[PDB]
Tab-separated table of C-alpha atoms and ligand atoms in Angstrom:
chain	number	residue	atom	x	y	z
A	1	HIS	CA	-1.775	-2.328	-24.252
A	2	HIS	CA	-2.851	-1.874	-20.644
A	3	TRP	CA	-1.055	0.061	-17.886
A	4	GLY	CA	1.864	-1.481	-16.070
A	5	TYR	CA	5.380	-0.594	-14.973
A	6	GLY	CA	7.379	-1.121	-18.117
A	7	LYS	CA	8.997	1.316	-20.531
A	8	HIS	CA	5.973	1.830	-22.742
A	9	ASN	CA	3.117	1.485	-20.227
A	10	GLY	CA	4.602	2.684	-16.940
A	11	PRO	CA	3.784	5.609	-14.607
A	12	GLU	CA	4.703	8.357	-17.074
A	13	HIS	CA	2.158	6.936	-19.528
A	14	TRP	CA	-0.772	6.523	-17.141
A	15	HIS	CA	-2.187	10.009	-17.648
A	16	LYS	CA	-3.311	9.133	-21.166
A	17	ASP	CA	-5.870	6.594	-19.976
A	18	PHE	CA	-6.272	8.269	-16.531
A	19	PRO	CA	-6.003	12.089	-16.733
A	20	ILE	CA	-6.417	12.384	-12.939
A	21	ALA	CA	-2.739	11.242	-12.852
A	22	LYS	CA	-1.907	14.916	-13.083
A	23	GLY	CA	-4.482	15.889	-10.547
A	24	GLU	CA	-4.298	18.002	-7.335
A	25	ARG	CA	-3.967	15.265	-4.718
A	26	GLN	CA	-1.960	12.412	-6.303
A	27	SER	CA	0.040	9.758	-4.414
A	28	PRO	CA	2.629	8.813	-3.465
A	29	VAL	CA	4.631	11.875	-2.334
A	30	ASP	CA	7.983	12.639	-0.762
A	31	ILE	CA	7.574	13.230	2.897
A	32	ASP	CA	9.803	16.125	3.863
A	33	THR	CA	10.146	15.488	7.569
A	34	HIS	CA	11.297	18.953	8.363
A	35	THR	CA	8.305	20.633	6.638
A	36	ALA	CA	5.775	18.187	8.052
A	37	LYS	CA	3.718	19.860	10.815
A	38	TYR	CA	3.025	18.335	14.225
A	39	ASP	CA	-0.747	18.357	14.632
A	40	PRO	CA	-2.318	18.356	18.172
A	41	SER	CA	-5.848	17.829	16.774
A	42	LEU	CA	-4.795	14.339	15.733
A	43	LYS	CA	-6.502	11.719	17.958
A	44	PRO	CA	-4.737	8.479	18.699
A	45	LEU	CA	-4.564	5.865	15.899
A	46	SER	CA	-6.613	2.684	16.518
A	47	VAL	CA	-5.702	-0.503	14.675
A	48	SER	CA	-8.035	-3.308	15.730
A	49	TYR	CA	-7.023	-6.433	13.800
A	50	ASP	CA	-7.720	-9.145	16.479
A	51	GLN	CA	-10.682	-10.629	14.496
A	52	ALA	CA	-9.286	-10.149	11.065
A	53	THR	CA	-10.332	-12.893	8.612
A	54	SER	CA	-8.039	-13.390	5.667
A	55	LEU	CA	-9.471	-15.380	2.787
A	56	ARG	CA	-7.181	-15.608	-0.155
A	57	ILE	CA	-3.943	-14.454	-1.737
A	58	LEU	CA	-4.045	-13.471	-5.443
A	59	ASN	CA	-1.570	-12.403	-8.161
A	60	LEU	CA	-3.400	-9.567	-9.937
A	61	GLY	CA	-0.479	-8.739	-12.250
A	62	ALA	CA	0.588	-5.468	-10.701
A	63	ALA	CA	1.129	-6.949	-7.239
A	64	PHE	CA	-0.236	-9.765	-5.032
A	65	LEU	CA	-3.109	-9.088	-2.709
A	66	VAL	CA	-4.048	-10.793	0.555
A	67	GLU	CA	-7.774	-10.265	0.756
A	68	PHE	CA	-10.008	-10.206	3.829
A	69	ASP	CA	-13.683	-10.761	4.661
A	70	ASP	CA	-14.934	-7.213	5.001
A	71	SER	CA	-18.668	-8.073	5.305
A	72	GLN	CA	-18.508	-7.319	9.007
A	73	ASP	CA	-16.655	-5.015	11.359
A	74	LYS	CA	-13.771	-7.362	12.178
A	75	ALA	CA	-10.559	-5.572	11.209
A	76	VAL	CA	-10.895	-1.801	11.463
A	77	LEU	CA	-8.858	1.335	11.451
A	78	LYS	CA	-10.094	4.420	13.311
A	79	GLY	CA	-8.855	7.503	15.092
A	80	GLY	CA	-5.839	9.435	13.930
A	81	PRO	CA	-7.030	11.861	11.246
A	82	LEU	CA	-10.052	9.699	10.504
A	83	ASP	CA	-13.674	10.358	11.186
A	84	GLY	CA	-15.616	7.123	11.499
A	85	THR	CA	-14.631	3.481	10.933
A	86	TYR	CA	-12.619	2.030	8.063
A	87	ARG	CA	-12.663	-1.724	7.363
A	88	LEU	CA	-9.676	-3.715	6.183
A	89	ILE	CA	-10.223	-5.166	2.690
A	90	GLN	CA	-6.774	-6.177	1.450
A	91	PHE	CA	-3.041	-5.645	1.778
A	92	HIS	CA	-0.341	-5.692	-0.840
A	93	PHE	CA	3.206	-4.512	-1.344
A	94	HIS	CA	5.344	-2.553	-3.760
A	95	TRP	CA	9.018	-3.414	-4.138
A	96	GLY	CA	12.216	-2.962	-6.148
A	97	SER	CA	14.570	-4.951	-8.283
A	98	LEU	CA	17.252	-3.872	-5.799
A	99	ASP	CA	17.219	-3.112	-2.103
A	100	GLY	CA	17.904	0.549	-2.867
A	101	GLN	CA	14.417	1.168	-4.291
A	102	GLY	CA	10.931	-0.165	-4.140
A	103	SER	CA	8.865	2.136	-1.907
A	104	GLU	CA	6.347	4.586	-3.277
A	105	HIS	CA	6.454	7.175	-0.586
A	106	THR	CA	9.895	8.520	0.201
A	107	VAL	CA	11.217	10.170	3.339
A	108	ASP	CA	13.506	13.107	2.715
A	109	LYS	CA	13.933	11.562	-0.719
A	110	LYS	CA	15.045	8.213	0.809
A	111	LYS	CA	13.569	5.124	-0.895
A	112	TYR	CA	12.985	1.992	1.107
A	113	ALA	CA	13.221	-1.579	-0.255
A	114	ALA	CA	9.447	-2.012	-0.282
A	115	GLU	CA	6.227	-0.563	1.017
A	116	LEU	CA	3.193	-2.337	2.538
A	117	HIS	CA	-0.325	-0.946	1.956
A	118	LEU	CA	-3.147	-2.016	4.213
A	119	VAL	CA	-6.252	-0.840	2.435
A	120	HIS	CA	-9.421	0.113	4.369
A	121	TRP	CA	-12.750	1.580	3.285
A	122	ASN	CA	-15.074	3.977	5.086
A	123	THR	CA	-18.063	1.986	6.359
A	124	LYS	CA	-20.414	4.884	5.797
A	125	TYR	CA	-20.222	4.153	2.043
A	126	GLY	CA	-21.330	0.563	2.368
A	127	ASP	CA	-18.701	-1.060	0.119
A	128	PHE	CA	-15.330	-0.555	-1.439
A	129	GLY	CA	-16.658	0.238	-4.914
A	130	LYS	CA	-18.738	3.109	-3.600
A	131	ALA	CA	-16.040	4.264	-1.186
A	132	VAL	CA	-13.462	4.867	-3.942
A	133	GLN	CA	-15.853	7.475	-5.464
A	134	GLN	CA	-15.675	9.566	-2.279
A	135	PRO	CA	-12.978	12.014	-1.214
A	136	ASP	CA	-12.795	10.295	2.202
A	137	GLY	CA	-13.552	6.833	0.958
A	138	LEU	CA	-10.342	4.990	1.874
A	139	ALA	CA	-7.713	4.985	4.553
A	140	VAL	CA	-4.460	3.319	3.600
A	141	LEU	CA	-1.875	2.463	6.160
A	142	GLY	CA	1.541	2.518	4.563
A	143	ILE	CA	4.480	0.811	6.174
A	144	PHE	CA	8.085	0.914	4.917
A	145	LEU	CA	10.235	-2.243	4.559
A	146	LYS	CA	13.964	-2.226	4.975
A	147	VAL	CA	16.318	-5.157	4.519
A	148	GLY	CA	17.874	-6.548	7.697
A	149	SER	CA	16.471	-9.102	10.158
A	150	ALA	CA	13.561	-11.236	8.991
A	151	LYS	CA	9.979	-10.382	9.847
A	152	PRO	CA	8.586	-13.688	11.214
A	153	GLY	CA	5.000	-12.569	10.616
A	154	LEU	CA	5.712	-12.133	6.934
A	155	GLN	CA	7.009	-15.587	6.391
A	156	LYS	CA	3.579	-17.239	5.767
A	157	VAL	CA	3.065	-14.792	2.985
A	158	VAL	CA	6.440	-15.446	1.337
A	159	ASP	CA	6.052	-19.207	1.519
A	160	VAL	CA	2.794	-19.247	-0.496
A	161	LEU	CA	4.126	-17.086	-3.325
A	162	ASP	CA	5.387	-20.111	-5.300
A	163	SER	CA	1.737	-21.123	-5.664
A	164	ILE	CA	0.748	-17.775	-7.208
A	165	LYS	CA	3.684	-17.094	-9.401
A	166	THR	CA	1.764	-15.762	-12.377
A	167	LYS	CA	-1.042	-13.309	-13.077
A	168	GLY	CA	-4.504	-14.811	-12.374
A	169	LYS	CA	-3.343	-17.392	-9.846
A	170	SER	CA	-4.973	-17.443	-6.417
A	171	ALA	CA	-4.571	-19.617	-3.329
A	172	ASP	CA	-6.525	-20.078	-0.094
A	173	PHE	CA	-4.951	-17.967	2.637
A	174	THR	CA	-6.933	-18.184	5.861
A	175	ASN	CA	-5.978	-17.358	9.418
A	176	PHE	CA	-3.213	-14.867	8.534
A	177	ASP	CA	-2.829	-12.291	11.268
A	178	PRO	CA	-1.813	-8.884	9.844
A	179	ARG	CA	-0.727	-7.692	13.306
A	180	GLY	CA	2.506	-9.617	12.607
A	181	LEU	CA	3.366	-6.967	9.967
A	182	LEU	CA	3.199	-3.927	12.161
A	183	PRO	CA	6.161	-2.099	13.683
A	184	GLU	CA	6.284	-1.225	17.419
A	185	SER	CA	5.385	2.414	17.016
A	186	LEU	CA	2.249	3.832	15.402
A	187	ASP	CA	3.768	7.318	14.976
A	188	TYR	CA	2.651	8.485	11.527
A	189	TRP	CA	2.502	11.138	8.852
A	190	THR	CA	-0.848	11.840	7.192
A	191	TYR	CA	-2.053	13.712	4.063
A	192	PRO	CA	-4.885	13.509	1.519
A	193	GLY	CA	-4.049	11.659	-1.659
A	194	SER	CA	-4.974	8.970	-4.143
A	195	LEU	CA	-4.716	5.383	-5.156
A	196	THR	CA	-1.214	4.837	-6.435
A	197	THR	CA	-2.391	2.522	-9.252
A	198	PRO	CA	-4.945	3.248	-12.019
A	199	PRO	CA	-7.684	4.456	-11.734
A	200	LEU	CA	-5.664	6.808	-9.438
A	201	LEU	CA	-8.850	8.054	-7.752
A	202	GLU	CA	-8.446	10.825	-5.220
A	203	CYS	CA	-10.180	9.033	-2.379
A	204	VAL	CA	-7.412	8.173	0.129
A	205	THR	CA	-6.472	9.479	3.502
A	206	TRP	CA	-2.848	8.308	3.719
A	207	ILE	CA	-1.384	7.272	7.039
A	208	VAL	CA	2.288	6.455	6.648
A	209	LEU	CA	4.092	4.965	9.669
A	210	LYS	CA	7.454	6.549	10.608
A	211	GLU	CA	8.986	3.209	11.797
A	212	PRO	CA	9.860	0.747	9.086
A	213	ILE	CA	9.675	-2.966	9.557
A	214	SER	CA	12.751	-5.049	8.801
A	215	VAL	CA	12.554	-8.015	6.480
A	216	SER	CA	15.262	-10.335	5.371
A	217	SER	CA	17.116	-10.384	2.069
A	218	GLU	CA	15.681	-13.837	1.495
A	219	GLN	CA	12.125	-12.650	2.086
A	220	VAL	CA	12.322	-9.782	-0.387
A	221	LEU	CA	14.143	-12.007	-2.863
A	222	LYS	CA	11.036	-14.208	-2.974
A	223	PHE	CA	8.848	-11.221	-3.856
A	224	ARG	CA	11.148	-10.745	-6.870
A	225	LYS	CA	10.504	-14.272	-8.152
A	226	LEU	CA	6.871	-13.386	-8.914
A	227	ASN	CA	5.764	-12.628	-12.510
A	228	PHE	CA	3.740	-9.777	-13.976
A	229	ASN	CA	2.608	-12.132	-16.739
A	230	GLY	CA	0.167	-15.013	-16.773
A	231	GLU	CA	1.277	-18.662	-17.130
A	232	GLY	CA	2.240	-19.486	-20.668
A	233	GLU	CA	3.059	-15.863	-21.399
A	234	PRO	CA	6.558	-14.375	-21.748
A	235	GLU	CA	8.251	-14.223	-18.288
A	236	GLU	CA	8.639	-10.742	-16.821
A	237	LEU	CA	9.669	-10.558	-13.216
A	238	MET	CA	7.373	-8.628	-10.917
A	239	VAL	CA	9.834	-6.046	-9.695
A	240	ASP	CA	9.768	-2.213	-9.490
A	241	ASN	CA	6.046	-2.122	-9.240
A	242	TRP	CA	6.095	1.290	-7.631
A	243	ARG	CA	4.862	4.700	-8.747
A	244	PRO	CA	7.375	7.479	-8.042
A	245	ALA	CA	6.712	10.585	-5.884
A	246	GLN	CA	4.185	13.012	-7.316
A	247	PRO	CA	3.969	16.823	-6.742
A	248	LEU	CA	2.681	17.808	-3.364
A	249	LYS	CA	0.838	20.792	-4.775
A	250	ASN	CA	-1.553	22.425	-2.371
A	251	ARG	CA	-1.129	19.989	0.528
A	252	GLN	CA	0.387	19.933	3.976
A	253	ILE	CA	1.708	16.715	5.510
A	254	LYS	CA	0.823	16.441	9.224
A	255	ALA	CA	2.794	14.483	11.817
A	256	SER	CA	1.313	12.664	14.869
A	257	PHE	CA	4.558	13.066	16.732
A	258	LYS	CA	7.175	15.677	17.632
B	301	ZN	ZN1	-0.303	0.071	-3.014
């Protein structure tokens, strides 16, 4: 009876196995744009993905991950609110059963159709496993998806999903350029938070881009054909794999823009 997104194992149940679910810096949160504070101390955000090396795409049950070779400084995030260098390890998405929901962060309570998370770890901690045990261990770039025009750079991801329909399946996925998933503007909000899936560790500097990317109805429809279950198990569509907004508590959200 492990955690998931269903009626009896979903987000309101997670605290029983993971008490930090009710902690002081949990994610996601609602971003109240009018209460967010423009911060002049914020240095420019640096996304250097030119030598990114994707390896594989995997259905882990709760989402699919595109994983990268993070054994060298090849795809890094720096600047913004960050001190030091954070290395890209994987990206994944959260999405809804309907276009009206799916994102984890919300903006003035608005839910987007999906949310992309590019996960990076602080190189001063040597690897991801050690990084998640640190309060500044990860930097996650969050990007909202709305339904409209297709995102051409997403299409290679959507076309391989038929090969990883069920939990446990993986496929080779080399030479994918995550620059094709970024919006024009790097304007962002930032705040200290957590992983949004168990173990919910409070190790994340969140950087959430203001500008969503547009993806087509057909593209998100393909996300919804995935399965939470493994092959040969009862079919349950991988939809609504999002945690809702958590209390902001003693935190301020900062904006990079005015
Ligand atoms: Zn995520």
